[PDB]
Each structure stands twice: as C-alpha cells, then as structure tokens.
Design a protein around this ligand. Structure first.
Ligand SMILES: Cc1cc(CCCOc2c(C)cc(-n3nnc(C)n3)cc2C)on1
Ligand SMILES: Cc1cc(CCCOc2c(C)cc(-n3nnc(C)n3)cc2C)on1
Ligand SMILES: Cc1cc(CCCOc2c(C)cc(-n3nnc(C)n3)cc2C)on1
Ligand SMILES: *C(=O)CCCCCCCCCCCCC
Ligand SMILES: *C(=O)CCCCCCCCCCCCC
Ligand SMILES: *C(=O)CCCCCCCCCCCCC
Ligand SMILES: *C(=O)CCCCCCCCCCCCC
Ligand SMILES: *C(=O)CCCCCCCCCCCCC
Lengths: 252, 285, 29, 238, 285, 60, 238, 285, 29, 29, 29, 29
C-alpha cells in the first residue's frame, strides 16, 4: 500500500500506516564526501550504524493555542548517543538526515501542521537594533523551542511565526522541502535531506545547517479536547562522518 | 551548432516554453485535478487536463528569467562621499567596509537564494560638485585593501603607494572606471545566509558577518589641496557575471534595518510593515 | 581568444583579456 | 593607426550593457566548486512551486496564520458565495505569494495559473464546492448560476484532500501587464457551495481550507523591472 | 549573391523602376483609358497606352521610399527640462510618461499607418546652460521605469539604485548617449490608432491611451548641489529600426492638439485650419 | 593596444547615421509576429492608389 | 573609419592591468643574459625552506639570539608544558619567519605546515617529548592528556637531532584568511614532556632546542596584498 | 597545445599543486619524521607520512605566486612636485635622480632577491591643483636624461629640445601617459645588493649607488606663465614585466632610512623597531 | 557575429552586440 | 605580430609594437 | 565591405559605410 | 595594406594610409 512506510536505520525501525509519501530534499539522497569535493586531509571516521540511527526527541503537546515549534540540526542531537559524542570530539562533521514527525489523532479531529526543513535559517531579533540572536537561544537542544512561551530577553530571537522568524512570509515556506500533516489524511511526515553547505564539512558546534520548523496552520479541533494530542520527532543521521579528532569540546 | 546557438542568443530563444495541445471531453476514473498537497509536491496538472483546449504554438522564451539575467544587472551598492568642508587632509579620503547589504534593491534579489557563486563587474560613477565654483583638476584613487593589508590613516599614508594592492586611478573628464573581480570567497559559494557563529559563547557573533569579510575600499582625492572646495560623490555599481545560485528562499517581506542580519522592526499596526493590503472581506475583489 | 565558428555566417566569440572573470554574461542552460 | 569613428553611446554607462573589463586580480585562482544540492538555473523553477495565498488578509487577520485560511461551515441558505479574488498575478492577495513576488520583478506576464485547495476538516466531514473562473469583459458573478457559466471545477471532498483549478490563458493580447491595468485585467475566481458542509454528530461545525497558486507549463514573465512590493525608506547601517 | 546584393545596397539600387517601352499608333475596340472607378480599383493604364512613347531606360530606384527609410530617421520626441531655480532637491529631477505623440513631425509620419512594428534607437542630446557662469561636473542619470516599478519621489529615492531597471549615466563632456530597445508591445504590433475602450461605461477611456502605456522615464542630476545654478535640457531623439507597417491611412490634415487622440479644433474660417489654399476659381492655375 | 586614429566626425550625432548600439533590455524576447492583412513595404504602394483632387477648392 | 564604441573603463589606470605600451628606447638591444646560479621562479620555492621561529620572543629576549631558543631541563613534576603557539601562519611568533612574511603578502592560505625541532644538548643528554596539534573548535589543551588526544608526534632524542611534526590542513573551508580571523583560526601546537630530560653526572643541566617551519607540498597562497609587517613612516632620502 | 596552454592562462591553472593520497598505519624502522637540520636541507616529510590521510583532489594553483605576478604590479616610486609659488621660471621645472629605493612598498619586494632582470612599464598620474582657481591649459614634458646628457638648468634650456633623448608630452585632460623600457643595465642583471666599492680607499663609495645609476628624469610645465598659480604633482608608477630573479634573501625587518643602503636606526627599545610582538611567556598563545 | 561573403570582394556584415535590436537599418524587400 | 593558434578556438597573441619590452606580462614556467 | 587581394601582400580595401558617397578619394584613370 | 606572413606566427605589416611617407620607421640594411 502507498499509505504505509517502514524506515530502518541501524537498530531502529519506524512505521506509519498513514503517510503522504516522502520528500527527498532537493532530490538529492545523502552520500559520503568524495575526494574531489573534500578539503580536510585526514581520514574521516564513519561510525555507521552506531550513529546513523533514529533518535527520538522530547514530545510536545499540540493544543488549540500552539503557535509552533522549531529545532536546529545538528544541535538537537548534540546529546544523542554516539552521534553526539562524535560531534564534540571532532572539529569537523558532515551528515544528512531522515526526519520523521509523528502525530496521530482520530477521524473526528481536524488540524494541519506545516513541516519544513530550512537550510541556513538565520533567525532575526525584533525591534532590538543590530543585536543578534544569542548562541544559547539558537542551541536549545532536543527540547527545541516552543514558539510564544519564552519570556523575552535582549538576545532572544523573533517569535513571529507568520514572518518565519526571519522577515519573510510564512506562506512562502513551501519553497523549502516540506510536507503537511493534515489529520484527515496522514499521521506522519517524512523528509530525507542531504548535506547542504558552501563547504564540504563544518563545525557542528557553531554552525546549524538545517532547521526543522513545525507550524500549525490549521488549529487543532475536536469534541474531545481532554485527550492530549502530542507531536513526536524522530531524527536519524545518514552518512555521518567526522574529522579532526581531539579532546571533547565542552560548551558554555 | 555554435552558430545556431548563436542565432538563439541574438534572438533570445534559447529556452522555449511548451505548446498547448488540443484536448477533448473526458469521462474517466482517473482524476488528475485531485491530489494531496500533504505530500509536499505540486500537482502537475496542466490546462489540457481541465478544459477542452485548442492547439496553440508557443513563442515565449524563458531566457530573461534565467539566474544570469535576474542578477546580471548593474545596481548601486554604495555611495561614497568626500565633502571638503574645513580640513583637506582629513576630509580628502575615506574608507568603506565592503558588502552588498546596504542597498535594498540588489540585496533583496541576491537574498532569494541561500548560496550564490559569481564574478563581479564594478562600475564607478564619480560626480564632482563645485561648492565654490571651480573643480580644477580632479584625480581619484580607489584602492582595494584586502583583509590584513595596512589601512591608510592619512591622505599621504605610505599604504597609498599600492605596491601590491590593486588601485584604480580616475581622471575627471575620462570615462567611468570599470573592472572585473573573480569569485572571492575562501569557500565554494558566497553565503547569503548563515545560521552559525564564530564561536560557542554568549558573545560570539552570528550571521554572515562571520563569513563575508571582503576587506576595505579606500578612496582619496589624489590632487593636493585646491582653493575651491568640492564634494565628490562616487557611486559604486555592482553586477554579477557567470552566476550560479542554490536553494531558493522566500523574498524579504519587511524593510531591512541592518547589514549582515535578518533583524527587523514591527510597528503596532503590522499591516503597515508588509506589502499586504487589507481586504474588506473574503468576497470583495 | 577567438572562438571562430563557421556556417557563410562566421561567429567571433572574442575574449579580450586573459582572465575568465573579464568576459561578459554567460550563455544559457 | 587604424582610422576609427567614435560612435554615439561611447563612454556612457548603461546598467544593462554587456561588455568585458580587465580583472583587478590577475593570476588569482578561484576556490574549487563543490556539489551543492538545490541549484536553481531559471526563476521559472520557483514559479512552478505552490505557495500559500494570504486570501483571508482582512485587517484583523494580517499578522496571524489565520490570514491563510478560509472557514467553511453548514449553510442555511443554498449556493452561498465563499470567496472571490482577482486572477491578476500581481494584484492583492496574490501579490505576496512567491509567484506574485517574482512577477513583480517583471513588466509582462502570460500563461495559465494553477490554483489548488486543500480541505482541512475531519475525515468524516463532507462537502462539494464549485470553483469558477470568469474571463474578463464582465463583472464578477453575483450568483453561483452566473459563475457556473464560465470555466469551473466541482470539487468533491474525499480521500484526496486537494483539488486544482486551472485558470487558462484567455486574453486578446499575447501578454498582460503585471501591474493593475484596465486593458489587461484577467478576470475573477469565485468559490460557491455546490451542496453543503455536512458532518455527523460530535464533530466540529467549521473547518479550514488552504489555498495555493503556481504557474503552469506555459507561464512566462518578461521585461525585468524593479519591484514595488519592497522599499527602503532609510539607510541600512552596520 | 550576398555580394551582388551588397553592391546594390551601397549603390541604393535594390528596387528599380520599370523602363518605358516604345509604343505605336492604335485603332482598336479595346479602350484601356476607359474604366469604372466605382469598382474601387485604380485604372492601371500607363503612358504607352495613351501616347506614342520612345524606349527609355530607367535608372531610378525606390530604395529611399521604403518604409524602413521613411521612418528610419532620428527625430525629436521630447525635451526634458531641469531648471535649478531655488530648490535643488525639488528641481534636480523629473519624470515623463513616454509616448511618440508630443512632436508633430515624427508623429504624423508614424500615423500614416494603422499598425507598425519596430525596434527603437534612442539618442540623447543633453545641453547644460550655465545660468550663473559655471557648470562644474555634471553627471546625469536616465532611468527607465516600466509600468509598475516604483517611481522616485525625491532626488535620493531608493528607486534610483536601479537594481533592476535600466539606467544610463552620462558624464558632461562625453559623447551623446544612445541605446536600442526591442519591440515592446504585449501585442504583435503597436496601435497607431485604436477604436476601442478599456471598458463599456460612459466613463471608459477611448483611444491609444488604453493600449500604448510605455512607462516612465525618470531623470536626475547625479551631482549633488553646486554653487552655480544650471539648466539642463535633454532632448530625446527616436528612430525606428527593422520596421513593418500595416494599413496605410490619410495624413493628418489639421494640427494636433493632444496626445493619444485625434481631437482637433476648427476656427470660424476653416480654410485657415488646413493646408488647402483657396482657388480664385476653377480655371485660375 | 592597437594604435588607432580618431577621425573627424567622431562623437557627432547625425540624425541619419546608421550605427549599432547596445540594447537596454537584454534577454528580452519580443511578442510573436502574427499575420495582419495590409502590410506596406514601400511608399510607392500608396502613390499608386487614386485619391480625389479638391479641384473646386474655392474659398466658399 | 571603423565605427567603435568606447567602453566604460577606458582611460582608467588600474595598477593591476595588463596592457602593452610603446617602448621609449627603440632599437635598443639589452645586455646578453648570463647564467647565474639560484634563479627563483615561484615564491613557493621559498616557502618550502625551513627558517627559525622566534618562539621565545618575550620582551626581554627580543634583540637577542636567545629569542630563537627554548630551554629544556630536568623536571620535578611530570608532563609539564614546554611551549604553546597558534598555528595561524601570519600570527605571532610565526609572522616574521620567511613563510609568515610571504604569507603576509597574500590574503588567503591553505595547505599543511611542517614544524621541525632540533635538540642541542650534549650527545649524552636524552629526552622524550610530545608535540601536539589541536584542531580548532576547542581551547588550547590544559594538560598533556588533553593535547595527546589530537594530532601528535612523540619525539625520542637520539643520533638524529631533528624531528618534524606536520600540521595537516583540517579546515571547513578550502582556504583561510592569513590575517587573524575568528572564523579561520587554525588551532594550536603545544609541547609537553613525555618522559624527562635526563643527563649523566658532570653534564649541563639545561639544553636549548631550535624550531623551524616551512610549507608542505600542498601549501598555497592566494590574492596578493600589501604587507602589514613593514611600514614607512617618513620619506626615504639620499 | 598553445590553445590548451591558453585555457590554462585564462583559468590561471598553469601550476597545479599535488593531491594528498590516502595513507595507512605503519610500523617500520624507517622514520621519515627523524632527520638532521645540521645538513642544511629541509626534511621533505609530507602529511601522508605522519597521519592517516584520505585521498583529496587539489585544485589550487601557484600561478599567482610566480615571480612575474609578485613583482608585476604597478606601485608608486616617486612623487614629483612643481609648486608655483612666486617665481615661475624657477619653479616650473625640476629633476629627479631615478631609483626604486624611495618607496618602501615596492622596494621591499624587489629586495627579496639579490639580482633581478626585468623590463619596466612606467605609468604617470599627474594632478593639477588650482591654487588660485583656474588651471588654464596645462601641458607637461617628461624628458629622460641618460647619464652624460646635458641636464637643463632653466625652463628654456636648449636641452629641452630633446633632439635625441626620449620625451613624453602630456596634455591635461588626455589619458595617463605610459611607456615601456627594456632592461637597462650594462650588466646581465640589476644588483639589488652590492657588497662592493667603486675604489679601494677609505673614501670609496659602497653599495648599489656604485652600480645602479639610471640617470635623471627632468620635468617642466611646457605652458608659459599663467595668471593663476598651480601645483602639479606627478606620481610615477612602476611595474616589472618579463621578470627573472636570483638568490632569494630575508625580507627587510626594520624601516628603511636611505636610498642605496641597508643602514637602519635602532631605538633604546628594539622591540618597537621590528614587527615581532613581545610574548607574555612561552606558553601564552 | 560575422556574415562573411566572398566574390575577391569579401563582405563583413558584423553584428557587434548580442541582441537583434542592436543592429542597424534593415536590408530591403 | 600575431601568434595565431587553432583548435574552432583560435588564439590571437598579438604584439602591437615592435619591441619586446612593449608586450604584456609573461607566460609562466 | 572588404576587397581582399593577395600577392604574401594582402590588400584590404574596406568600405566602412553602406553608401558609395562615404568612401574616400577615387582611384585613377 | 597588409603584408601577411606565416610561420603559427603570422605577421601583419599593415600600412593604414595610401602614401609611403605615412608609414613608420624603416626596416634595416
Ligand atoms: C557576498 C559578497 C560579494 C562581495 C564582493 C563585492 C565586491 O566588492 C568590491 C568592490 C565593491 C570594489 C573593489 N575594488 N574597488 N577598487 C578596487 C581596485 N577594487 C573590490 C571589491 C572586492 O561582497 N559580498
Ligand atoms: C508606439 C510607441 C512606442 C514607444 C516606445 C518609445 C521608446 O520609449 C522609450 C524612451 C524614449 C526612452 C527609454 N529609456 N531611456 N533611458 C532608458 C534606460 N530607457 C525607454 C523607452 C521605452 O512609445 N510609443
Ligand atoms: C634597479 C633599477 C631599475 C631602474 C629603472 C627604473 C626606470 O626608471 C625610469 C623612469 C622611472 C622614468 C623614465 N622616463 N620617464 N620619461 C621618459 C621619457 N623616460 C626612464 C627611466 C629609466 O631603476 N633602478
Ligand atoms: C585571445 O586570447 C587574443 C585576443 C586578441 C585580441 C585581438 C582581436 C582582433 C584580431 C585582429 C587580427 C586580424 C586577422 C589578421
Ligand atoms: C559576433 O557575434 C561576434 C562579434 C565579434 C566582434 C569582433 C569583430 C572583429 C574581429 C577581429 C578578429 C580578426 C581575425 C583574427
Ligand atoms: C605584428 O607585428 C603586426 C601588428 C599588426 C597590428 C594589426 C592587428 C589587426 C589585424 C587586422 C587585419 C584583419 C585581417 C584582414
Ligand atoms: C562591408 O560592407 C562591411 C564592413 C565591416 C567593417 C568591419 C571590418 C573589420 C573586420 C574584422 C573581422 C576580423 C576577421 C575575423
Ligand atoms: C591596405 O592598403 C588597406 C588598409 C586596411 C585597414 C584595415 C585593416 C584591418 C582589417 C580588418 C578585417 C578583418 C578580416 C575580415
């Protein structure tokens, strides 16, 4: 059936009996760095199955007033098993991902989530002059950011979901790899993205390549509101490789 | 045939759009009009699928919509001012930290992509205003100072010797200066956006300022002090050549406020900050 | 730098300077 | 030397000229190109991707995601009108969609437009709607009967959430101005209830619908110009 | 042979007129001189038919009477004035709604056809009048603003950045600016006349104003304010290239009064409004 | 560079000259030509058609 | 004459242009070339030769040959740090070495660096040292254990006086700025005692060590610029 | 193939750097890392020898690091001043003993070699300062006077006739003068350094002054005295073409003080005389 | 853009710019 | 002085003056 | 308009404009 | 007036005017 899907990565297998196909970002499947494009000259380390596996993040609650959530990669995985360890022990890192967003309800619920993967999502600050989003705020880890909750602070980024947190209109987010979780049609969204960057490898500690944004564009409604409807995200790195080994970087 | 291709260039018919074919009534259990946007894909339905069309021969071309064409137009990126008021030695030279973020028109266009690689054509338009009546003989020197090279601190600084840096000398009366520059990054493409820092502490810088340092442009009126004071404004125009762009993004919806940052300001009445014109209601066209 | 084609309709795609950045707008596709 | 005749135009600087010029950095060798996914070669590639229409951009909705949704509900009167907008690519509310923004960097346009609509009610909510396109030379339809006489699609909500209505290129001239111009206004798109929004008991009595727009295979823009959908009222500083 | 054709071009002998042949006395019941203008056709009778002609070899050519030649001459179509009187910011820039209807000489020629398709060559002749004695360094900017693009409202408007629009910068002293433009209509030919409206109500506009919108030409003195005031007049000359014309019509017989309209005014003594010179009587040559 | 000799006439603007000039709208593709009856190629075509002579043009 | 179009740029003087120009001394015949040993054709030839690093350039040492030496001696504490410097080619104390001076005439650099060390103690003095390179993204190591986790070489002093440590090109971007730039700082090189400086009786209890630097086969500089390692504050007269 | 070589020139890929090859763990009694600097040779060890490398394809080129490129950039070598103050006949002409030692920027570069052979390209940038308001018609004459030729002693000296010497006349308004010169030495290469004297007595001269006599450059304002006084500064730019260099040497570490000599001055705090920045200690990066 | 003919009387119908609008007056008939 | 090469990609290494010093920068290696 | 002769001593009698009046002085006899 | 030689190193000894006095310095011997 075209409504079913099974994704196996390492020791993890994920399923969904109500999918809306899958999206391969920019039509390119993740792959290891080739010698023509490489620049760093040491032999890379490729953990393989111990790092290229599904990691499930903290679940979130979707309610009639939710404004959205966002996570940044590789940040969201910094504390996830071997993948996490590797990104701190090495200066350089490279990786693709399979992002599987889960959200089931009932045939009597309605609502719609816009799931987007944005490359270089350079967040903005509102009415704060030329002060930019602080490191700490763009590195929330697996908890991600719950739009509209954070008690403002100077280096706090924009929380305007209709302006994509960066000065562009939400309706044009569709130009980026995306999918919708329309409760009447599917209960999950799957996106596979390749490594995208102007350099072959990069510091995973200071550069977040992709940003996962989830915005409920159609409010969640039903006649059984007491039943909590969570959103769960599972992300699996793909073709993760690291270079420039040394002692473990400790942040903060 | 390079010649046939040549003709296509002269006529601008390199990329043609498809024709519309005749279609007919249909009664089928295949419904192209129905799909699922949830997938993230755009339904590829065409006119022939929803109405009975006639056959029409297209003659429209997409040449002008090419990335090379879109970004291949010279636009202003800086207005350098040298206003001699009361101190020639101090007011006869200046410097600018190069960037393509100060003028909204071209900035917005480049920023419709995440990465871009191109060569640059710089054209300068200097205009000398005779504040006191005469302009005498004006000769200008525009020196490119790459990051690291000594920046002149006085109009006679030794750095103006330009023993290695590239300098362009223009003589008033002669045609507008112009030169080309090769793709300058230390990376494979320029970052139009950068979700990264130059460190991992609360005080690390964020954004393109970390990756897009292009150095400094230092100008000076070569002519020594003259009786009559002048104001020289040099407008720098930039154009991308041999362009390549990656990962398109939504266009800037609100005004820019600063360079190297997506920061913006919102008023109390947001509808005034965006180009969206309020509708009376859903059915009022 | 002359890319002389022939068809007679001869084409002369001359490159006056020795740097690639110096040439004009690119051909398409 | 070779006798020459300096021609008018010499020494001028046209922002759209295509000449060669000496390179300031001789011998310099650019950084090697690496493969980056997502290369774009022509803007048409972006005009072919669906983006949302801020169709419900009433003053109170602007600045809210709700400006992108249309609400449907059980009617007590038949054939009621749901929404109506101009088909003109750079008119509001189409202006800020990706295709509208790009069209605003050009003076002329042509081709057919693809309007899509995704129903967001429950899986148990049914509905039949009529989407119609009215070619120019007449006012917007005042009733479903009037609209139905033009180009239209009857959408039946079911397993497949989305439907597409194609606005064919029906014009006297080969191109039209992107900016609002009487002579080239393209017409209207109106939506009406064909039957009714129906739900079983214990089910939300209202539902949202999303609207997209993109260009068909024949879409094409011409004559580059600066956009009027963005401005700079002051200096942009460091 | 492209070379033989070439010689014909140099000598202007591409279209030759026929010779006159010798003819003789005739007595026949075929009378070519008699016909019927009612038919709407012109009697094709030639000299050999009505008199006894000799043989004569023609060497006249019709090259110069070609449509390309008739319309291929540069004529003035606009005189733009920038007169700095008392407010530089307001008087140093202006705008013009483009059209070929303001100057009678070229307007009348194009209007001898109903439709015409051609490319345009624009040549500009700027002249700076030194009202106060000096002209300093004058640099001009002519920007083409297609319909829809933002029109600058001040001499420093962001629109002058010309990030996409085509702009031409001229420096006083340098040769006259000149550029070409391709056939610009959204139709297949330009309408010289249009018996239509942009609507069907008593207030709908009538005529070519509905179809011939070419946008705006915005000019500005790039140089900032100078001590001495100047008056810059830029005359725009237009010439049609690669021309095609359809359906010839009678020439304008009375003076023009407005653009985009055939409206005219008549005095009480109409013979003064037309070029017809009153005759004393039928037999006074 | 190639030695050149600027000749008299240079820089002048003759309304009847026949030179080339850069195009302000690069890449622009003109609207397709359609067939329109009545094309005229030479003014002689109009000189060969009969028109009326206002022979009785006395002032009255 | 031949119609020409004078293009923008004409008449300008760009210091890096490459045009031809008439010769002021026609018919002149230059002096015959003779063979001279030591011809240089490319600056890389000079970047590949070892020069000394003024590693011990403390204020009191500058102006003395001792600024070029590091002193070693018997330790009473294990794994002590000996020295530490930035790997950045144009940073101090690398700046005034031949390769640092040349790099300072360019804006970009890339490739691997070769650091060499010559022990100068007596033939009877032994020692084992650890030389380590720490790639960026972390602070300089605070202990031998920390340093040892990166790239390193354990040097055993013996018949062969010199050892070389290669700092591989480990960077995100293909090139780095030669001038100090956060984004492109290349990391550090630290030296630690692996065992200890040991000598027999009646032998000097301290010894010097020299440090060299040169570029590997992949070293390369780009974008010529004027150096900031030399200046002219006044006229140079006869 | 001259064409393939041509492409390499356009792309600047004439001298490519080698690739890095994959390497593996090793356990051997051959230790490349160990050597002996005493020999005077640099240990040729490469990255593959000390760590496990991956295979990487290099695309860097050494073209820009060529001697031709290093010295092939036009830099200022002299600033000639003609300041008309109170005596036109005396102040309207001057002379300069030619040398490439007066400007540190280019001097330091050439001095990185012991001998060098090259052709020279001279470009002049004259700028006329209107001290009193007008500049009138300025015409300059730059005459090269080889050693031995008569040096003019007045603005009307017969030597200005230039019956044999090469002179260059520039007219204000015209483009910058420029000409080439062939390798001028009486030897096979120019001496950048010379450990010799022109004699063997306590008063014999030492250094390059003995071997590098290039003659004199004599300038004069051809125009006769004008009402308004002007100050003409002519900056001379030099560039080496078709270059060859021998025996590289260390770069100048301290400021230059005089021409033709390596003499220098030291302050009491030497660390201020050199570019070396004092270190806090051995372990402070 | 060179339309080189030969007859020797060689013709060089050069088109200096890459747009058709840029060329001079048209040939006749 | 024209060093016309052919490959068609024709090269025209023209030397406009009769002295070697007059030519531009040298080729490498 | 190029009247290319050959003898090698090649002659290039170029006519830069398309009118006969535009050319220079006439040849003799 | 073009004295085109070939060796490829083609020589173009062009004489731009029709008088012998107009040409440059003479060749030697
Ligand atoms: C991204 C991105 C790309 C660029 C480079 C823009 C080009 O910048 C300049 C300019 C405007 C002028 C000059 N020069 N002006 N005069 C001389 C000589 N160089 C050099 C550079 C790099 O800036 N940001
Ligand atoms: C019919 C018909 C045809 C035309 C077009 C006339 C050309 O109009 C212009 C002019 C006169 C100048 C410019 N520009 N001036 N400067 C620049 C740049 N463009 C552009 C157009 C379309 O107008 N009516
Ligand atoms: C070593 C070394 C090499 C040189 C020669 C430098 C070139 O010097 C000049 C200059 C700067 C100008 C002129 N001329 N200026 N005008 C004329 C004519 N010649 C002639 C020479 C030899 O000087 N030292
Ligand atoms: C290519 O790299 C060389 C560029 C040469 C420019 C000169 C082009 C004009 C050629 C004229 C020669 C005519 C044939 C004898
Ligand atoms: C056509 O599209 C290209 C236009 C080229 C203009 C240059 C014409 C002059 C040719 C000189 C080359 C001489 C032959 C070696
Ligand atoms: C070489 O020593 C002679 C230099 C000649 C310069 C002229 C180059 C341009 C050639 C144009 C001729 C076109 C072929 C008929
Ligand atoms: C004749 O009627 C046409 C006049 C053409 C003038 C151009 C002459 C210069 C030719 C340069 C082309 C070089 C050969 C590739
Ligand atoms: C000789 O007597 C005639 C002088 C001709 C001068 C023109 C030289 C340039 C030739 C360009 C033609 C290119 C070949 C098609």
């Amino acid at each position: 059936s075209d409504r079913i899907i099974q994704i196996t990565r390492g020791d993890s297998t994920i399923t969904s009996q109500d999918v809306a196909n899958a999206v391969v970002g920019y039509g390119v499947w993740p792959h290891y760095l080739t010698p023509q494009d490489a620049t760093a000259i040491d032999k890379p380390t490729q953990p393989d199955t111990s790092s290229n596996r599904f990691y499930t993040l903290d679940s979130k609650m979707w309610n009639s007033t939710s404004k959205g959530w966002w996570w940044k990669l590789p940040d969201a995985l910094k504390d996830m098993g071997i993948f996490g360890e590797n990104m701190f022990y090495h200066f350089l890192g490279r990786s693709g991902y399979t992002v599987h967003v889960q959200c089931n309800a009932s045939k009597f619920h309605q609502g719609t989530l816009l799931v987007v993967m944005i490359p270089e999502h350079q967040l903005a600050t509102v009415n704060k002059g030329n002060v930019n989003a602080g490191y700490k705020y763009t590195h929330p880890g697996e908890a991600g950011r719950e739009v509209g909750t954070q008690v403002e602070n100077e280096k706090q980024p924009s929380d305007d979901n209709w302006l994509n947190f960066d000065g562009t209109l939400l309706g044009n987010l569709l130009i980026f790899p995306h999918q919708f979780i329309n409760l009447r049609s599917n209960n999950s969204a799957t996106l596979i993205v390749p490594y995208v960057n102007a350099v072959p490898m990069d510091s995973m500690v200071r550069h977040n390549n992709w940003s996962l944004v989830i915005i409920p564009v159609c409010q969640l409604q039903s006649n059984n509101i007491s039943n909590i409807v969570p959103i769960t995200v599972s992300i699996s790195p793909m073709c993760a490789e690291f270079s420039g080994a040394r002692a473990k970087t400790v942040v903060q | 045939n390079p010649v046939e291709r040549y003709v296509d260039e002269v006529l601008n018919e390199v990329l043609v759009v498809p024709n519309i074919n005749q279609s007919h009534p249909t009664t089928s259990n295949a419904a192209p009009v129905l799909d699922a946007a949830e997938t993230g894909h755009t339904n590829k339905i065409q006119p022939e699928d929803t109405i009975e069309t006639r056959y029409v021969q297209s003659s429209q071309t997409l040449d002008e919509m090419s990335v090379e064409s879109f970004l291949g137009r010279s636009g202003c990126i800086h207005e350098s001012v040298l206003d001699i008021v009361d101190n020639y030695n101090d007011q006869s030279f200046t410097k600018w930290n190069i960037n393509l973020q100060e003028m909204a028109q071209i900035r917005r266009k480049f920023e419709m992509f995440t990465y871009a690689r191109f060569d640059s054509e710089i054209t300068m338009v200097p205009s000398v205003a005779a504040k006191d009546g005469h302009i005498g003989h004006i000769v200008m020197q525009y020196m490119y100072v790459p990051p690291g090279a000594p920046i002149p601190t006085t109009r006679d600084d030794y750095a103006w010797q330009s023993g290695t840096n590239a300098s362009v000398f223009w003589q008033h009366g002669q045609p507008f200066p112009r030169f080309s520059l090769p793709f300058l990054s230390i990376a494979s493409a320029y970052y139009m956006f950068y979700d990264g820092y130059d460190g991992d502490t609360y005080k690390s810088r964020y954004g393109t300022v970390v990756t897009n340092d292009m150095g400094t442009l230092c100008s000076r009126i070569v002519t020594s002090e003259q009786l009559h004071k002048v104001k020289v404004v040099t407008r720098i125009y930039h154009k991308a050549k041999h362009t390549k762009a990656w990962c398109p993004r939504p266009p800037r919806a609100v005004q820019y406020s600063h360079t190297h940052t997506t920061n913006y300001k919102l008023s109390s009445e947001v509808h005034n900050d965006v180009a969206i014109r309020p509708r009376t209601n859903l059915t009022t066209v | 730098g002359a890319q002389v084609s022939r068809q007679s309709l001869n084409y002369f795609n001359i490159n006056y300077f020795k740097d690639a950045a110096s040439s004009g707008a690119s051909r398409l596709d | 030397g070779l006798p020459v005749y300096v021609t008018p135009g010499s020494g001028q600087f046209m922002t759209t000229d295509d000449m060669q010029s000496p390179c300031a950095l001789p011998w310099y060798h650019p950084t090697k190109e690496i493969f980056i996914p997502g290369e774009v070669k022509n803007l048409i590639e972006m005009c072919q991707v669906d983006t949302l229409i801020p169709i419900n951009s009433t003053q109170s909705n602007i600045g809210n995601v709700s400006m992108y949704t249309v609400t449907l509900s059980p009617q007590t009167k038949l054939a009621e009108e749901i929404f109506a907008i101009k088909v003109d690519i750079a008119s509001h509310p189409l202006a800020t969609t990706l295709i509208g923004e790009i069209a605003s960097y050009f003076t002329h346009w042509t081709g057919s437009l693809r309007f899509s609509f995704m129903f967001c009610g429950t899986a148990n909510t049914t509905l039949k709607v009529l989407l119609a396109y009215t070619p120019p030379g007449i006012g917007k339809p005042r009733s479903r009967k009037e609209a139905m006489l033009g180009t239209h699609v009857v959408w039946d909500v079911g397993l497949q959430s989305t439907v597409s209505l194609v606005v064919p290129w029906i014009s006297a001239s080969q191109y039209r101005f992107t900016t609002p111009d009487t002579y080239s206004s393209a017409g209207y798109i109106t939506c009406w209830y064909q039957t009714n929004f129906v739900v079983p008991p214990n089910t939300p009595n209202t539902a949202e619908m999303l609207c997209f727009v993109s260009g068909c295979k024949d879409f094409c823009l011409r004559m580059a110009r600066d956009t009027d959908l963005h401005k700079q009222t002051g200096p942009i500083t460091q």
